[PDB]
Design a protein around this ligand. Structure first.
Ligand SMILES: Nc1ccn([C@@H]2O[C@H](COP(=O)(O)OP(=O)(O)OP(=O)(O)O)[C@@H](O)[C@H]2O)c(=O)n1
Ligand SMILES: Nc1ccn([C@@H]2O[C@H](COP(=O)(O)OP(=O)(O)OP(=O)(O)O)[C@@H](O)[C@H]2O)c(=O)n1
Ligand SMILES: Nc1ccn([C@@H]2O[C@H](COP(=O)(O)OP(=O)(O)OP(=O)(O)O)[C@@H](O)[C@H]2O)c(=O)n1
Ligand SMILES: Nc1ccn([C@@H]2O[C@H](COP(=O)(O)OP(=O)(O)OP(=O)(O)O)[C@@H](O)[C@H]2O)c(=O)n1
Ligand SMILES: Nc1ccn([C@@H]2O[C@H](COP(=O)(O)OP(=O)(O)OP(=O)(O)O)[C@@H](O)[C@H]2O)c(=O)n1
Ligand SMILES: Nc1ccn([C@@H]2O[C@H](COP(=O)(O)OP(=O)(O)OP(=O)(O)O)[C@@H](O)[C@H]2O)c(=O)n1
Ligand SMILES: Nc1ccn([C@@H]2O[C@H](COP(=O)(O)OP(=O)(O)O)[C@@H](O)[C@H]2O)c(=O)n1
Ligand SMILES: Nc1ccn([C@@H]2O[C@H](COP(=O)(O)O)[C@@H](O)[C@H]2O)c(=O)n1
Ligand SMILES: Nc1ccn([C@@H]2O[C@H](COP(=O)(O)O)[C@@H](O)[C@H]2O)c(=O)n1
Ligand SMILES: Nc1ccn([C@@H]2O[C@H](COP(=O)(O)O)[C@@H](O)[C@H]2O)c(=O)n1
Ligand SMILES: Nc1ccn([C@@H]2O[C@H](COP(=O)(O)O)[C@@H](O)[C@H]2O)c(=O)n1
Ligand SMILES: [Cl-]
Ligand SMILES: [Cl-]
Ligand SMILES: [Mg+2]
Ligand SMILES: [Mg+2]
Ligand SMILES: [Mg+2]
Ligand SMILES: [Mg+2]
Ligand SMILES: [Mg+2]
Ligand SMILES: [Mg+2]
Ligand SMILES: [Mg+2]
Ligand SMILES: [Mg+2]
Ligand code: NA
Ligand code: NA
Ligand code: NA
Lengths: 66, 65, 69, 66, 66, 67
């Protein structure tokens, strides 16, 4: 988790808009509200729970630093 | 489970209708009756048992805390 | 595991409740649960078969059944 | 594996013709030559090692008893 | 693991048997197995490629092996 | 981890251009900036975090030294 956790935490704390892409090709958009080992809480209209096992890639709207 | 459990449990307790989206694009709907480490029981006619490994997202029909 | 899944499958097993088992690729199987363990479900009817749980999305009983408490 | 292991072992010992369906819908056919925790070695003109993670169902050509 | 997979892959590696590796999405990769660990297989050719076992359905040797 | 980690570390230190194929057939291109047990940070027009569980293959643009 030495990369994933600080990365997700940075996006969370700075409230960076992100896109989360799913394995079926669906694009979800919002901000990382929180996360644990297995899931990410993505906010916009409501805060939906996204299982990491379904995610292919997380792409921030702007570059960020760790 | 610091987040998954309390979130699912809040949805369960408040009886909030949800959409559960499967990794193949299928959409399920109902209320969460119960859950464990590996499954979610989704009610609305007969209950159905949904394997977490097949779920992409759980989306509440209204915001919760 | 787990605390909900096993008694639910065992209830379908013991009561011979006919079920639909949907696979991750959209295939629907139908029969009765004859047996199961941690990783597989043995499904019987027209033909008997072993189903890996990793390929299953949902199990839907033909009628309501008692849920685990 | 209380059920999986004796079931695969019986198909093996009794040379039962089986059909193996993969998660992508491909059907493989033959007989179980051997297996371990993660893979099945399938035979019949073409020997191949199949990863259990890609298998949806194993369907024998006649019922087995355990 | 394990008791079948490892000697099977190791035999293919030592004997430099050309193999076909089918991915879960139906793509076929070809080459010779250069190396492997618990999670990946390195498939040697022009450039080698690192293949994640979780993406593999079957390994199919070009010739019967033992 | 004996093969995977030094292989990615080589790609990373040497900044080798790579293609990353996802299990759904999508091809990503760039360079490996960093990685851990579960994710790879892929640098292109902007960095993106890719879960290893969604990756099928990693193919360098030129031959590299193997572990
Ligand atoms: N996490 C998600 C969200 C949506 N979708 C796909 O996108 C479609 C539509 O999603 P959405 O934009 O949320 O509109 P819906 O009102 O859910 O459309 P419908 O319920 O009629 O399917 C769904 O059927 C589903 O196939 C998906 O696969 N995964
Ligand atoms: N401590 C952990 C555990 C897992 N994960 C992420 O969550 C995914 C695993 O989620 P899970 O739902 O538990 O896995 P499965 O869907 O069962 O995948 P598999 O069958 O390959 O085990 C991993 O790929 C990893 O990306 C993580 O970030 N940190
Ligand atoms: N958990 C589920 C539910 C259904 N489906 C897919 O959605 C299709 C139709 O949904 P549904 O009406 O719930 O099932 P069926 O009774 O088979 O549909 P129909 O009677 O319209 O053929 C099914 O064929 C199945 O491929 C799925 O993949 N996973
Ligand atoms: N566990 C299963 C069972 C079936 N199917 C798909 O369902 C299709 C047709 O089902 P069925 O007729 O039962 O199997 P077939 O192989 O088509 O039998 P046959 O061609 O001899 O009629 C198969 O091609 C297979 O891809 C699947 O993907 N997973
Ligand atoms: N384990 C397997 C076996 C086959 N297939 C798919 O089935 C297709 C056709 O099967 P096959 O006749 O074996 O095609 P080839 O791979 O081209 O076989 P060959 O060139 O040796 O004739 C393959 O291309 C592949 O997409 C697959 O997805 N996974
Ligand atoms: N490990 C791989 C390699 C290929 N593909 C699929 O196969 C398609 C094309 O095959 P190929 O021609 O070999 O890939 P290209 O992207 O066109 O690269 P190149 O032609 O230079 O090999 C890709 O779009 C990709 O969807 C895949 O999913 N997994
Ligand atoms: N004790 C267990 C272990 C796994 N399982 C189920 O089996 C799935 C994992 O099976 P598997 O080991 O075949 O997974 P893959 O990594 O092969 O996809 C989990 O997602 C659970 O649904 C279970 O129900 N109880
Ligand atoms: N601690 C856990 C264990 C499993 N799970 C769910 O159950 C599934 C178990 O699959 P594995 O056996 O491969 O771990 C995961 O894919 C995940 O959806 C979870 O969400 N939290
Ligand atoms: N202890 C175990 C773990 C996995 N398995 C099998 O191996 C596959 C699981 O692969 P995962 O390694 O990715 O855990 C499944 O087909 C499962 O039935 C097993 O048969 N015994
Ligand atoms: N010890 C291990 C662990 C995993 N594996 C293979 O790797 C798969 C899981 O890899 P992932 O961690 O990438 O999901 C298993 O299903 C199995 O095919 C193995 O062959 N030996
Ligand atoms: N030791 C480890 C642990 C995880 N992994 C990667 O992280 C992913 C974790 O998902 P799973 O737990 O579902 O296997 C694996 O699919 C694999 O690609 C790895 O490559 N080596
Ligand atoms: Cl019910
Ligand atoms: Cl191909
Ligand atoms: Mg599950
Ligand atoms: Mg699993
Ligand atoms: Mg897991
Ligand atoms: Mg696994
Ligand atoms: Mg796996
Ligand atoms: Mg694994
Ligand atoms: Mg690593
Ligand atoms: Mg995986
Ligand atoms: Na598992
Ligand atoms: Na009942
Ligand atoms: Na798929």
């Amino acid at each position: 988790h030495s990369l994933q956790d600080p990365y997700l935490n940075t996006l969370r704390k700075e409230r960076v808009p992100v896109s989360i892409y799913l394995v079926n090709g669906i694009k979800l958009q919002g901000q990382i509200e929180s996360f644990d080992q297995f899931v990410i809480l993505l906010k916009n209209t409501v805060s939906q729970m996204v299982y990491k096992h379904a995610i292919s890639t997380v792409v921030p709207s702007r570059p960020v630093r760790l």
